[PDB]
Amino acid sequence: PLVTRLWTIGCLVLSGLTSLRIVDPGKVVYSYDLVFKKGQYGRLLYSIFDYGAFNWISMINIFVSANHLSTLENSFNLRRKFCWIIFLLLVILVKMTSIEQPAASLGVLLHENLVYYELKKNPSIFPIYMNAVMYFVYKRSWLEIAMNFMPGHVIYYMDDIIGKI
Amino acid sequence: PWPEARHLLNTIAKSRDPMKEAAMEVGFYVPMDYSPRNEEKNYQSIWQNEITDSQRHIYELLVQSSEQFNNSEATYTLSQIHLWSQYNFPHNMTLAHKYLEKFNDLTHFTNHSAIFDLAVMYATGGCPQDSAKALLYYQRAAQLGNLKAKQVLAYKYYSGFNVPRNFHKSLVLYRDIAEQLRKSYSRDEWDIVFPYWESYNVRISDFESGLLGKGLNSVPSSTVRKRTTRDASERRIIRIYYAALNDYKGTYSQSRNCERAKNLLELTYKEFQPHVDNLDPLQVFYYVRCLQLLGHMYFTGEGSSKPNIHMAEEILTTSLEISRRAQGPIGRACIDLGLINQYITNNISQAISYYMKAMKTQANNGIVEFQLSKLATSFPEEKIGDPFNLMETAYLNGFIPAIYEFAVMIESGNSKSSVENTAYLFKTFVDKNEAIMAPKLRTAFAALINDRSEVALWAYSQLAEQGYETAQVSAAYLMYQLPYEFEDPPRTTDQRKTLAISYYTRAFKQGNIDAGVVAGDIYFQMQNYSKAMALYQGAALKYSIQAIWNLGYMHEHGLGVNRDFHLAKRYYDQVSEHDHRFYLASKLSVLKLHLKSWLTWIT
Amino acid sequence: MVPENRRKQLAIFVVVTYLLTFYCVYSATKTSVSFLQVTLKLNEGFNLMVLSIFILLNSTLLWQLLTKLLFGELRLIEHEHIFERLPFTIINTLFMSSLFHERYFFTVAFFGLLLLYLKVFHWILKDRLEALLQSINDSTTMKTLIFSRFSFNLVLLAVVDYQIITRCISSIYTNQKSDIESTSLYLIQVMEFTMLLIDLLNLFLQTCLNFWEFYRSQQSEGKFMYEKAIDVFTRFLKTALHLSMLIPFRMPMMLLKDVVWDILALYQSGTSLWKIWRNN
C-alpha cells in the first residue's frame, strides 16, 4: 500500500498540524475561489489531504477509507490509467467547484469518487457508510451531489465505452 | 572666556529625544554584566576617536574656565554634561561627583538641585553608602522647598524603609505637597479639561518576555499603550481611523503628533459628509468615532491655536443625531457637550440631562461624577445623588483631581477617619500626577533607546527613591537579571548586587509579587540559603507558583531544612492543585522524589 | 511478523525519534529560565506531539520485551489470531476515546492502550491453553509444577487486573466529585477489565474441568454438557454485569452494540440449551 500509505500519512500529519494550529487554518481551507485568485495549488493538495481534520471519528474515516483505496489500487497494475483518471477527475471537479465552491474538503471528494468509480466498475460497513453520508450531506445542492458522484462514473463510462469501442 | 564658551554651547543641541523626532516621518538592547575596567577603556576610546576637534577645544576651554576661576557656572554645566551625557559627551560617574562636590562648596548649601543629586549619590554609594549623611542632605534640601525631596522623605516615613514607621509625618508632608501641587494648576486646567501628559510609568522589561519567565509571572503585564490595532471601500475608513488614533495618543516609540491628525480628520469629514447615508454596514460606526475624536480635538484646542466652540458644538450634536439610529456610542460626545454647555453657555439642566445620559457608559472615567458632585454641592435643591457617594465612586474610578477633592472632603468629615486611609490617598494623588514630579522618566527612556544605558540607570535609580515602583523594578532589571539555564550568571560587582536586592525587595513590599522571587534567587546565587525562604514563604502566602516549587526544591535538598520529603510532596501537590498546566511537572518531580527514596532504600 | 525492510524501517524510525526529541528538549532548555518554564514549553503542541510519539515507541518496545519475557516466542497460529482480531478492537477502543473532550485526553489513551495490551495477553494465553491441551503428553501427569506454571501466567494476569479494578473503584469511591464524567469513564474501564476477569475465571474453570477429567482418567456423562454449561454461565455473568452497569450510566451507543452482541450470545445460549436437551 505504498501510495496509499503516503496518502494516509500526509492526511494524519495535516490533521496533527491543524489540530494544534501550527499552520494557519485560513490558508488550507482555500477553495477554488481562493486558490484561483491566489494560484495556490498547494492548498488544493492540502484539501485532498485534510478535512479540517481533528476528529478521532474522522481518524477512523481516514483509516478505513485508505483501506478501501488500497482495495481499489491493488487490483490494477494499470496504474498509469489511475493517474489519467485522477487527473481528469481533479480538473473537472475544479470546474464544478468554480461553479459551486462546496464546503467539504477535497480529500472527501477524491476518495469518494474513486470509491464510486470502482464500485460502478463492479468491512462492507464503510463504503455504504460513505455513500449514504455524502448523498445526505450534498443532496441539498443541485450540483454538489453531482460533483460527488456523477463525474466518477462519467470517467468510468468513458473508459467502459473505450473498452467497447 | 565663559561668555564665548556659552555662545558656542548654544550651538550643539544638548540632547535629542527620538521619541519625538519619530513623529515627523521598536525595542532595544540592555547589557547583561559590567566591568569598571571595560567602561574605563570604552570611555578612553571614545575620547580618543569619536569626539570632534570642535568638541575638543570646547571642552578644554570649559575645563580651563572652571579650574582657573571658580566660575561656579562652568562647574555646574560641566557636571550636567558629564552626568546626563548631553551635547554628545560620554558618561563619567566619578567626575560628576567631584564637580558637584566643588559646586556645593562654592554655593554653601543653597542650590538645591545639586543637593538632591549629591544626596542620592551618597545614598546609593555609586562613586560605600552612609544613610546618615544622605538623610541630613535630604533634610536640608527639604528645608529650601524642593518638592521631590519632601516627597521622598515623606515616603521613607511611610514605607518605614531605613527609618522607624511614622504615619503622621508622611501625612503632614503629603498634605503640604498636594497643596503646593493644587496651586500649580489654573482654574481652567483643573476644572475644565485635564492637561493630558504622555505617561511613561510603564516598567521596563515588559517589552521583553517579562519577568521570571513568560506565561508564569503573576502580576499582569503593564504596557497600557503601544500601537493599538484590530477590503478597498470599507477598510479605507478602518485604516484612517486607526491611524488617527495612533497619532493622537502617541505610543512609547513615537510621541504624539497633533496637527497631523487634525488635518487628516478635517480631510476625511469634508470628503465623506455629503453621502454619509450610504455607509450603513459597518463604516457608520467608525465614521462616528472619528467624528467624535475630531470634535473633542477641536474643543480642546490641541494641534491648533485656539478652540472652535460653535463649530465643535454643531459637529458633536450632528454626531449624536447620526448615532441616534444605528445606536453607536454616545459617551465622549455627551461628556464634551456637558463640559461646554456647563461653562461656555450657562444652561445647566440640559447639561445635567447629558451627564445622566453618559453616566453608565464605559469610556467615562471620572469627569462625570466629579462635575456632578461639584454642581450638587453648589445647588443642593437638584436632588442629584450624594456628594460623598459621587466623589467616592470617582476616586474609585481613576480620575486625578477627584483624589484631591475626595481627600479634602474626607478629612473634614467620621466615615472611618483613620490616618492610614488619608495617608494612602494623599500618597496616591501625589505620586500619580507624574508630570511635575517625575519628568525624568522621559529622559530615561530616551537615553535608553540610544545606547546610553548607564545614565538610564542613574535616572531610574534617582526615581526609585520617590516610590515609583515601576522605576524600582526597572533599575533592578538593569542591574541584575535572571540567566537562562546552564549558562553563566552575570559577572558584575557585589555592591551592584546588594543594591539590586534592596530595590527588588522594597518593590515587593510595595504590592508587587514576582520580584521577591528574583531576590530569593539572588540570595541563593549569593549562597545565603537562610533569609531566602522568608521571601519565598511570604510570596507563597500570595500564591506564587514558581515560588512554591522553589520552596519545595529548597526543602528536599539539605540546605537550611534537612530533607523533609513529606512536606515536599505536600507542596508539589499544592502547586499541581492551584493551577492546571503544571500537572506534568508536579508529577515528574514527585517521581524524582520517589526514585531517590528507592535508591536510598536499596542501601 | 516483521520483514527485514520493516526491521530497518523501525531501526531508522527509532534513531530519528531519539535525535528529534533530544533536539527539541535541548533547544527548549537553552531558551528558558526555570524548570517550570521548560515544562510549560515542552507541553506546547508541536513538542507535545513529538513527545507523545516518543512515548508510544518506548511503550511498544517495553511491550515487546515484556511479551518476549513471558512467552518466549509465539506460534504462527497465535500471530494469525492476533492479526485477525486486533482491528475491530482497535476501532472500538477508539470509540471509547471518542466519548470525552480535551478534558479527558491522555490518561484515557493510557488506560486504553493498557487494556488493549492486556486483551492481547488474554487471547495469547487462551490459545496457549488450547495448545497445551492439544500438545498434552500422557507420558507424565499434570504435575503440580506444570499446572502451577501455566497458572502462574494466569494469576499474573488475574491479580494484575484485580489490583487495577480495586485502584479504579477506590478512585471512584473516594472521588464522589462534581465531575461525574470522570467516574463514568472509570466505571467503563472497570467494565472492560471485569470482562477480562470473568474471562479468566471462565478459562480457569475450563482447565479445572479438563484437569479433573485427566485426574479420574489416570485414577479410574457428557463432558460437553459441562463445557457449554461453563460457557453459558460465564457469558451470563458478563451480560448480567453489563446490564447492571450500563443501566446506571445510561450509555447511548456502547449500550446498544454491547447488549445486542450479548443477546446473540444468548441466542447461542439457547442453542446450547437445546443441545443439552438433546443430550439430557
Add this chain to the structure above:
Amino acid sequence: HNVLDVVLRYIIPDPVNDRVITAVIKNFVLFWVTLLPYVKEKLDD
C-alpha cells in the same frame, strides 16, 4: 424490457460513423438510467 434495447439502437450504424456525438449523447441518456447494471451487462448481449 427491450424498449431500453430500442434506446440502445443508434442512428446510422456502425461505430465507424461520424455520428459519434450521437453515440456519446445516447450514452449520456443511458447514463441517466445507470441505477441498474442489468443494462450494462446486456449491452454485450
